Design an enzyme around this catalytic site. Structure first.
Site, PDB file in Angstrom:
ATOM      1  N   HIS D 146       0.813  -1.232   0.000  1.00 10.43           N
ATOM      2  CA  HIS D 146       0.000   0.000   0.000  1.00 10.43           C
ATOM      3  C   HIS D 146       0.838   1.271   0.000  1.00 10.43           C
ATOM      4  O   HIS D 146       0.356   2.324   0.435  1.00 10.43           O
ATOM      5  CB  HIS D 146      -0.946   0.074   1.215  1.00 10.43           C
ATOM      6  CG  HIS D 146      -1.711  -1.183   1.482  1.00 10.43           C
ATOM      7  ND1 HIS D 146      -2.912  -1.468   0.868  1.00 10.43           N
ATOM      8  CD2 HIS D 146      -1.466  -2.214   2.327  1.00 10.43           C
ATOM      9  CE1 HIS D 146      -3.369  -2.627   1.316  1.00 10.43           C
ATOM     10  NE2 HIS D 146      -2.514  -3.097   2.207  1.00 10.43           N
ATOM     11  N   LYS D 273      17.134  19.429  -9.543  1.00 13.18           N
ATOM     12  CA  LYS D 273      15.900  18.740  -9.931  1.00 13.18           C
ATOM     13  C   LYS D 273      16.080  17.903 -11.188  1.00 13.18           C
ATOM     14  O   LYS D 273      16.651  18.364 -12.169  1.00 13.18           O
ATOM     15  CB  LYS D 273      14.764  19.726 -10.147  1.00 13.18           C
ATOM     16  CG  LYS D 273      13.513  19.052 -10.696  1.00 13.18           C
ATOM     17  CD  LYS D 273      12.277  19.881 -10.445  1.00 13.18           C
ATOM     18  CE  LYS D 273      11.934  20.771 -11.609  1.00 13.18           C
ATOM     19  NZ  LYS D 273      10.652  21.477 -11.337  1.00 13.18           N
ATOM     20  N   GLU D 280       8.115   7.765 -16.963  1.00 18.87           N
ATOM     21  CA  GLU D 280       6.788   8.310 -17.215  1.00 18.87           C
ATOM     22  C   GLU D 280       6.276   7.937 -18.600  1.00 18.87           C
ATOM     23  O   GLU D 280       5.109   7.595 -18.770  1.00 18.87           O
ATOM     24  CB  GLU D 280       6.800   9.827 -17.069  1.00 18.87           C
ATOM     25  CG  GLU D 280       6.824  10.299 -15.640  1.00 18.87           C
ATOM     26  CD  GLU D 280       7.009  11.789 -15.593  1.00 18.87           C
ATOM     27  OE1 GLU D 280       6.206  12.466 -14.942  1.00 18.87           O
ATOM     28  OE2 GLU D 280       7.953  12.281 -16.231  1.00 18.87           O
TER      29      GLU D 280
END
Lengths: 455, 455, 455, 455
Positions: D146, D273, D280
């Site tokens: 989970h 970043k 993706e």
């Protein structure tokens, strides 16, 4: 008679019993049709209506239900009516009846109620999102792209971003219902009734907005079911995006939210661990409803006209999608409403990684500075700040001026997370003033949609 | 920079070049944004617009195209503009621009054009159906259910049953376009522009009806794409029903239609043998387009907010569905329009197998005869006529009376196919009078839908 | 405690009761695990096993079922076991138990039984096709391409063309089962049991062929379920092709087959008209099973490791596909077995439209005649026979020689349908000799698959 | 001639050109077939092979390509051959040639090459997972269920849990190949060739393992393409799971991994970043490939036999799925290979939230303690530790004895994460010794599967 295999294959009572009240309504309507056609005395009319009322009671309290020998809900209710008024009077309802326009009619009547139960559940999730947004109107968090931090945003702006897709789905329901609200009754087996009945009158009596234009199309087409399946799949996918956010937010690594004990599962021993089961089941069931849609379209593909027994497969995927949403929507609404937001956690991450250097550059560009130059200035600020081990906001007036004479102390206005979000003040922006206007418009949009769905 | 594998994976120029004119339009709009923000001189602005029109013409005539090194259409066009006005003036356009709101806006602009090219094709199929129906107003054929002959119907009635679903698809396009017509420009990467631009004005300038309510939703959501894919899938499925009919009609066993040389394949050897390839490709491609939809929903499932690179996968299935329909609709339109209907063959088959026994029983029921009794009467007439090997019409009055005293000679009103269809004279029925009204309304509905799509 | 909405959403007893016997088996096996671990006395062991035997009998005859308060089948049976042996002994089973490896194990066990029931049904359809092929060894029919007549073929060749796909499906079941036959028991929640149990021993006990290689993958992965869903969808699609042929064959326009009263629907009135409902339901449900597959892959997509609640959605689509095929396969088998083939009708149609001209042209090619000239000769032959209104066979030796000196009177070897099919005598061709070998080989292949599927 | 709309719809050269080398290979094969049949002299034979060799060179170097007027790759190569040897010699190849068996044969040949390009890419991803696991043998992380922390596991165990599904996929490829390797060449249009050719000889010549059993089935069926679509979809779904993990692991909140600059996108402003674009896109394209599969099954549904133009639609979804995987697999392999794991971070998180209390309770149960006693003891230890603000291992021998006499100091062997995972030492468990064996077995399985795919 039919082989055992044929009877077992064609039997629909394990799923079509939900149509029973609609079948009884249609039977009541048909009794009037026969009366107007002079084919029933008032004595017979009243006897039939009494029997149907009695049957409706027994269906409602469960004292009457299908037998294994009933092929479908209509046959079960005909047996039930005959048990109640005898075969002579009971059998008189068979006049002017067809099974193809009837089954299409009942599915539409059912679907128009179903889509409004779903709509009510959607409005509840929108309500829960709006309520959390109003309760936390000043909390700031990282805005994510690629699950990476970009511009700071208000938590409220993120929460409401999940309401707008659902409002669009409500709009889809409204558009759908117009198509759904056309009655096929009076189209017969395929070619139109020869009884001289009145489709327009029957349509009004049954709660439709109009009667159909072509008996063949009215009895053969099921694009209304396909469309409903798409809207349900869309709603489910929209919940799954919200679900994915909550599942990730809930992770102890993120720690953006704490789940409520009543709206999660938890460990026997690990005291504070809670699992996002509701969100996970929303995620999983969205794939289920996509499949229901894809499969129904494949069922409809390459059907010759008119009615074929293929079309019996129209109901179960749509029934399934509605039943799943009826479970998911109140569960997601309660999950959302019971969330606890860990505001320090979210705010602490929001300016990390010198993301505010973007705001610095954008500010410079607004001052008339060329974009490349602004960028270079932002880079200089990032490097300067990194040397001292401070945030951009902690750079001195002299250091800022050093990098560029355009970097006046006024630039610090967007070097705080409040200042950052407040500068994004166009329509739809994350600035507090715009989010406030957005939130009120959501309340009005929802109320307008709700009233459009009132019959 | 990027590894070769990464560069190859993310490259989109093999399909996104169709966005080029829209990207140029957006760039013209952004030149205005920047001038309104006082960030461009009048000379700079005119220099950019002129350079954009140079680039536009070179795109339109194929002079300018992407390179292998270009990652996407926007980068290619930026390279093109810089080649045409120099990096100094060219780079000034970058001010206040974001990729994510731009790519959402471009897809919507493309889609609102695409859905209209599709709508035109749909109107052409509806017109071909109307054309064939109008040309054969009195031809009667068997009405099929389960591919078995039931009630006789008008050929026109059957043909038009394929037009009503397409009109509903047009209605769906109209409904979809309102949701499509919302502009994300000004939403930035996700949080909203900090430039101080006016999203409502940029929306107007780009041809949108309104600007977005939430920057995160505007840049992240793609339900508009899924809805378009659904509508395209539905159109394709509706064409596959028409296709299936034509394929069966075309078989030499049916012989309902003869295909046109220019709209079928055949052999030189056997001149009469023609294949319905266009209908078969329509059938096959409906599966493809169901797949595009299902796959796109699966792509959108469980996306966390906001923009993720996943969303790049929004265009190709929708581009594919549109390109297929743009081939299919004129192909199907011409196939339908050039059909030869073999009306004697269809009329000869219409009363086969004593199907008019149904009309007989229905007539008896209209006369007040109980249903069971009417069916017994119907069974008796078939047997009686079967024994003499004649049609039901050919039963003598005495015989008809022998079977039942209720069977007056008047029952002959429905014992021909002309009288059968004539009795079905309620709204939507196959009676010539209703069908003529139906056909009139179809032309009016089509035109009204067409006007609704004029921008 | 859980909210009502949470309890309602997570409850699985409306579909997982079919797992009850497998759950009981797992409990028996786990009693043996605990005893081996020295955690149960011989009495405790025998007491538990006796209680589980009691429980199994009460489950099997319906005296024990789930309550509304039971979340799942395992909780229901735990309740039942405690009712039968008291909480002290019953609670001792909980030692060393984990939910996640168990639910994965149970589904697999159920699926390996389910797939074999499906396989038996597939073999029955194959058998029914083979039997109809064996009963009509010489009947020749039109060979359809594009639903148009091409080369004449043996009816047996066409029928067996629907058996080979199903045999391939059986081959897919065999390949699937090797993957299915791996036990997750002992993988625990995700990381593997710390009880020191023996997964290989437990695997054998539970009917598996091996134990899993990775506890995380064993508990999280569901590709075995997606693969079963694919195979069931493939079977359904293969049945839909057979269904389509039967539906067309059944049309009164084709008249290739007459349906059986017990394997079709119809009306007493017109005894002759019969609807192929079984085939139509097979066609419709194939769409449904494609949907189940698509949705399940959409559910499995983008799952992070390890177990997530989303996984609970693995069963219902697979249960539905199996339940549908268990209804469909006997119905289709009985439908095929019940068909009456109208062989004279099919024989009459087989040489229509001068299709044997192709065989003529091909015969010329075999003689060394150039391709294009052979074709004009054939086209000449057709028009010559077209003129006289006779078949190609009826062209006199003079007329043949006239058309071409290579067209000896021997060509007539291929100008009858019998001679046509006899020339196609390579492996897989429609010549009687080849088809007899093909049919013999199908029986052997079916038997080989049947044997592979018994454990 | 064919209308523009017909020609445009049927044209396949925009995607079929990849079949050019396979078509050339078949043409060589057919040249031999005709020679064996004595329908070519040696001069004609060698003249044809010489022409085909020239054509193959020109195709391979781009000198020869399709024209707008070519309908398909076969027609284009035929044109090209006539250009090189003149219409007389060229036109002789058409003898004994059919379109339907050829197109099925070329697709199969293409597909068997394609599935091996895919397999190699899959083995590359397996290799990258295995080398990272080998590189990090002692790293322990939170085991997630989970997306919540449960049992600690080795990072190597988790990474290898993504290898096993891929191995299963490789196994599926091996199984699929056997079905694929059956030749349809010789089945003609549908009924088998009358030329007297040898299907077994041609099959072996073209690289197939065998020739087909039924000409109708060999030319009409496309389940082999459906099965490949499924294996490709399943591979994509398995990459999507690995992708989701990497995306979540990459978030700054998790910080489990740092992406490599050449295998991610970065920000021009935020210096640290990095976006997981490859993962993706893998996630997004998995939806795409599910769609391809669903659409293809929908296309194959309800096809009457034999060849229908529908079946042209078989190639593009499979072509698309292969083309996507061929991009994705090297991208994901290099993504995985270049990851930097932050092992301190994962280690610090693994024992958080008192998860080791589960290990505590289990250790007690191993000491014969009643299950409920173990669980309330563990709960007590947690409460004890929680108030001292210490971890369970920091409990003194006396505090442990207080909670329960059974909690001897030896319980501490599972109150570190190393001791926790060390206790899970059954097959498939996360203990270092088991994982080492697992990792070695993966190497052997990978190599075995590779050898099986060697033709």
């Amino acid at each position: 008679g039919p082989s055992d295999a044929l009877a077992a294959l064609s039997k629909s009572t394990h799923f079509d019993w939900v149509l029973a009240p609609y079948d009884l309504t249609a039977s009541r309507a048909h009794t009037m049709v026969l009366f107007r056609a002079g084919l029933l005395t008032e004595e017979q009319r009243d006897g039939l209506l009494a029997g149907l009322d009695s049957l409706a009671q027994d269906v409602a309290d469960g004292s009457f239900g299908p037998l294994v020998t009933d092929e479908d809900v209509h046959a079960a209710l005909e047996r039930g009516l005959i048990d109640r008024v005898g075969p002579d009077l009971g059998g008189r309802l068979r006049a002017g009846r067809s099974r193809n326009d009837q089954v299409a009619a009942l599915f539409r009547m059912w679907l128009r109620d179903a889509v409004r139960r779903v709509a009510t559940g959607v409005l509840d999730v929108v309500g829960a999102l709006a309520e959390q947004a109003a309760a936390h109107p000043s909390a700031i968090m990282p805005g994510k792209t690629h699950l990476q931090s970009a511009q700071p945003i208000l938590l409220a702006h993120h929460l409401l971003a999940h309401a707008h897709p659902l409002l669009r789905d409500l709009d889809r329901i409204v558009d759908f219902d117009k198509r759904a609200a056309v009655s096929p009754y009076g189209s017969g087996a395929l070619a139109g009734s020869s009884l001289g009945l009145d489709p327009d009158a029957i349509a009004a009596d049954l709660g439709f907005s109009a009667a159909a234009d072509n008996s063949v199309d009215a009895t053969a087409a099921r694009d209304f079911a396909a469309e409903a399946a798409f809207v349900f799949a869309m709603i489910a996918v929209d919940l799954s995006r919200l679900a994915e956010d909550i599942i990730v937010w809930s992770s102890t690594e993120f720690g953006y939210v704490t789940l409520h004990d009543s709206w999660s599962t938890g460990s026997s021993i690990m005291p504070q661990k809670k699992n996002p089961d509701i969100a996970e089941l929303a995620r999983g069931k969205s794939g289920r409803l996509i499949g229901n849609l894809a499969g129904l379209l494949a069922t409809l593909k390459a059907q010759p006209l008119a009615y074929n027994r293929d079309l019996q497969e129209d109901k179960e995927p749509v029934f399934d999608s509605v039943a799943q949403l009826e479970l998911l929507l109140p569960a997601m609404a309660g999950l959302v409403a019971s969330l606890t937001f860990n505001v320090q956690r979210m705010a602490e991450l929001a300016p990390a990684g010198y993301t505010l250097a973007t705001d610095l550059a954008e500010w410079l560009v607004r001052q008339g500075v060329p974009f490349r130059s602004a960028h270079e200035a932002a880079g200089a600020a990032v490097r300067a700040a990194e040397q001292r081990g401070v945030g951009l906001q902690e750079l001195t007036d002299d250091e800022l001026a050093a990098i560029s004479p355009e970097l006046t102390p006024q630039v610090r206005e967007v070097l705080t997370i409040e200042g950052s979000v407040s500068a994004r003040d166009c329509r739809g922006g994350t600035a507090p003033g715009r989010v406030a206007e957005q939130l009120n418009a959501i309340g009005e949009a929802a109320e307008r949609l709700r009233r459009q769905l009132v019959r």
